[PDB]
């Protein structure tokens, strides 16, 4: 499946991520690509042999902007570093 946080078990590599098609090219022997800090940035589709990038799903910290309990009980929430599309 592509573009949905999913559990990915390309043979030999187990991870949770959003699997998207990628432009970087692996040499024929290479299976899973890796990036600085040693994380599994990309995997090669075993059956279709295409480079499928792996990205971790959305994470961040909610913060509550409150006028003050005395002034009001209405609140706002800033979901830090997330894209409005994935908030709900």
């Amino acid at each position: 499946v592509k573009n949905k946080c999913v559990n990915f078990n390309f043979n030999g590599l187990k991870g949770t991520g959003v699997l998207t098609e990628s432009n970087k090219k692996f040499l024929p022997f290479q299976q899973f690509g890796r990036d600085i800090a040693d994380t599994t940035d990309a995997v090669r589709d075993p059956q279709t042999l295409e480079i499928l990038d792996i990205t971790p799903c959305s994470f961040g910290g909610v913060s509550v902007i409150t006028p003050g309990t005395n002034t009001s009980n209405q609140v706002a929430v800033l979901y830090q570093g997330v894209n409005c599309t994935e908030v709900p």
Binding site: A37, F59, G60, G61
Partner: peptide
């Protein structure tokens, strides 16, 4: 500005005063 030049739970929060107000 030219000369001087995502993770496992480590997020860099943004600076409150944008560099266009500084």
């Amino acid at each position: 500005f030219n000369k001087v030049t995502k993770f496992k739970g480590l997020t860099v929060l943004p600076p409150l005063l944008t560099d266009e107000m500084i």
